[PDB]
Amino acid sequence: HHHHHFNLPPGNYKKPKLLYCSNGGHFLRILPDGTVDGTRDRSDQHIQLQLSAESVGEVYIKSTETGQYLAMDTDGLLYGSQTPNSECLFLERLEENHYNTYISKAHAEKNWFVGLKKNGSCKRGPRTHYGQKAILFLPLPV
């Protein structure tokens, strides 16, 4: 179980989704240039994400618009990847019996989470921690 709990969020991956971060109320966004951030604008065409599971609890997060996969690099930075690889896998877990969190599988030991600051900028892996609102997401079916 990759040294982590296995409480999982309900639902399925059939329909693409919007990942709403309760921190600043932003939707996770993957820009065409590979940049990742969050925006409050629901009309944005880069927040529709298709999730799919490698194995139970392990997921890929893909922009339906550009086809890029969410990924975190060796230094904890999120980016849009043209090709699905090991940096594109995240351990999708329930948190506080309510939210969805996403731990980079490649850096699961250090608990590096996908997260958005209140200003809508992405947090760097090492700066995320259990207990922050930055790592809490609420998925919305498109």
Curated annotation (Swiss-Prot):
Tissue: Predominantly expressed in kidney and brain. Detected at much lower levels in heart and skeletal muscle.
Effect of N23A: No effect on integrin-binding
Post-translational modification (record): In the nucleus, phosphorylated by PKC/PRKCD.
Variant or mutagenesis effect after changing Y99A: No effect on integrin- and heparin-binding, loss of FGFR1-binding, defective in inducing FGF1 signaling, cell proliferation and cell migration
Heparin-binding, as annotated region: 117-133
Protein's cellular compartments: Secreted; Cytoplasm; Cytoplasm, Cell cortex; Cytoplasm, Cytosol
Keyword Iron: no
Motif (Nuclear localization signal): 14-17
Phenotypic consequence of K123E: Loss of CSNK2A-, CSNK2B- and LRRC59-binding. Reduced integrin-binding. Defective in integrin-, heparin- and FGFR1-binding, and defective in inducing FGF1 signaling, cell proliferation and cell migration
Protein residues bound to heparin: N23
BP GO annotations: activation of protein kinase B activity; anatomical structure morphogenesis; angiogenesis; branch elongation involved in ureteric bud branching; cellular response to heat; epithelial cell proliferation; fibroblast growth factor receptor signaling pathway; lung development
A Pfam family that the UniProt record links to this protein: FGF
Keywords carried by this UniProt record: Acetylation, Angiogenesis, Cytoplasm, Developmental protein, Differentiation, Growth factor, Heparin-binding, Mitogen, Nucleus, Phosphoprotein, Secreted
Cross-referenced InterPro entries: Fibroblast_GF_fam, IL1/FGF
Result of altering K117E: Reduced integrin-binding. Defective in integrin-, heparin- and FGFR1-binding, and defective in inducing FGF1 signaling, cell proliferation and cell migration
MF-aspect GO terms: fibroblast growth factor receptor binding; growth factor activity; heparin binding; integrin binding; S100 protein binding
Stated consequence of mutating S121A: Decrease in LRRC59-binding
Membrane-crossing segments per the record: none
Effect of S104A: Decrease in LRRC59-binding
Job of this protein: Plays an important role in the regulation of cell survival, cell division, angiogenesis, cell differentiation and cell migration. Functions as a potent mitogen in vitro. Acts as a ligand for FGFR1 and integrins. Binds to FGFR1 in the presence of heparin leading to FGFR1 dimerization and activation via sequential autophosphorylation on tyrosine residues which act as docking sites for interacting proteins, leading to the activation of several signaling cascades. Binds to integrin ITGAV:ITGB3.
Subunit structure: Monomer. Homodimer. Interacts with FGFR1, FGFR2, FGFR3 and FGFR4. Affinity between fibroblast growth factors (FGFs) and their receptors is increased by heparan sulfate glycosaminoglycans that function as coreceptors. Found in a complex with FGFBP1, FGF1 and FGF2. Interacts with FGFBP1. Part of a Cu(2+)-dependent multiprotein aggregate containing FGF1, S100A13 and SYT1. Interacts with SYT1. Interacts with S100A13. Interacts with LRRC59. Interacts with CSNKA, CSNKB and FIBP. While binding with LRRC59, CSNKA and FIBP seem mutually exclusive, CSNKB and FIBP may cooperatively interact with FGF1.
Name assigned to this protein: Fibroblast growth factor 1
Lineage, top ranks: Eukaryota, Metazoa, Chordata, Craniata, Vertebrata
